[PDB]
Design a binder for this molecule. Structure first.
Ligand code: ADP
Length: 323
């Protein structure tokens, strides 16, 4: 039968059950890694860790009263931690709206617990958000910064797979994936390299600070601890391409194509990445170096509907040509 599709039947069941379409259609699962790599370049370990946890939960091998999976993502800023959480929410649960992000730098000071589970009588951000979306990826950023009382509420989710809010009713977390992140150790490494410490001292200092914040009792609850890597030059080039996709899409609406020389792509990659911020500068580099002078060319009619535009490097920056 060809007229009524899988998605039609999943959609009706989803609307009636609250179970996301992609969850109901999970099996119709082996490809999860390939799907995640559509958006996340490199960080293969992270992707496999996440996919393995999900496979174990689906195969009935894990505790049904704990979340689907829980991870700590260590390593530097701007190399894919958030992109993977987003991509995982969109993939498992059909939208990025299914990613709940919590910045622990906003939960350092004691009363912040109320902000999470609700003020004491006389609701909470998290508990309300998870009540209404039980199928969600929950991203806690900079977990070491959490006030201890906030830290303990996370431990309850890991241990119990649920929370009781201030109203005294349970909120279910058994269908969540928990991703914790921390930058710890990364500025210390750069500081060591700047001050010319020996590898020995750099390593010892990183281990000290990790031991200080993350104890076995905590770490043992997680499916995996993953250390994200810095990105290679090639990986940044592939990210540049991903970040040009929407621009190409808009250009193609006027049948304009963009043909970047290798030097051009490397020009954007070099400017759009650094050790401190990872690939976070890349978006505005593209905007300033490519989209703005291209806009000018189009508005002057030097670039026209149908044109194929070679983008190269000139002295002042990127240069544009049409054959
Ligand atoms: N591994 C990666 N794969 C694809 N895109 C990436 C990757 N790492 C970084 N990016 C891109 O650069 C940005 C990195 O910043 P962000 O997601 O804010 O990093 P963080 O995980 O530190 O929050 C993303 O918005 C994304 O477009």
């Amino acid at each position: 039968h060809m007229e009524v599709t899988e998605e039609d039947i999943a959609e009706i069941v989803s609307r009636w059950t609250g179970i996301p379409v992609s969850k109901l259609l999970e099996g119709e699962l082996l490809r999860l890694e390939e799907e995640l790599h559509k958006r996340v370049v490199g960080q293969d370990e992270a992707i496999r860790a996440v996919a393995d946890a999900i496979r174990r939960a689906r195969a009935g091998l894990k505790d049904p009263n704990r979340p689907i999976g829980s991870f700590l993502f260590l390593g530097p800023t701007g190399v894919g931690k958030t992109e993977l959480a987003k991509t995982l929410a969109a993939t498992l649960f059909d939208t990025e709206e299914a990613m709940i992000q919590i910045d622990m730098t906003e939960y350092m000071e004691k009363h912040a617990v109320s902000r999470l589970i609700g003020a004491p009588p006389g609701g909470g951000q998290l508990t309300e958000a998870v009540r209404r979306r039980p199928y969600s990826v929950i991203l806690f950023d900079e977990i070491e910064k959490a006030h201890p009382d906030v830290f303990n509420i996370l431990l309850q989710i890991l241990d119990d797979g649920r929370l009781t809010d201030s109203h005294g009713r349970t909120v279910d977390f058994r269908n969540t994936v928990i991703i914790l992140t921390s930058n710890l150790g990364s500025p210390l490494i750069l500081e060591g390299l700047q001050k010319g410490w020996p590898y020995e001292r750099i390593r010892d200092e990183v281990f000290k600070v990790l031991q200080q914040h993350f104890r076995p009792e905590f770490l043992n609850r997680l499916d995996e601890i993953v250390v994200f890597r810095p990105l290679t030059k090639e990986q940044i080039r592939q990210i540049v391409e991903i970040q040009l996709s929407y621009l190409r899409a808009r250009l193609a609406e006027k049948r304009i194509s963009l043909e970047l020389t290798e030097a051009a792509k490397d020009f954007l990659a070099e400017r759009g990445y650094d050790p401190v911020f990872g690939a976070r500068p890349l978006r505005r580099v593209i905007q300033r170096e490519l989209e703005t002078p291209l806009a000018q060319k189009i508005l002057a009619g030097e670039v026209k509907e149908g044109d194929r535009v070679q983008v190269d490097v000139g002295p002042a920056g990127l240069v544009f040509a049409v054959p």
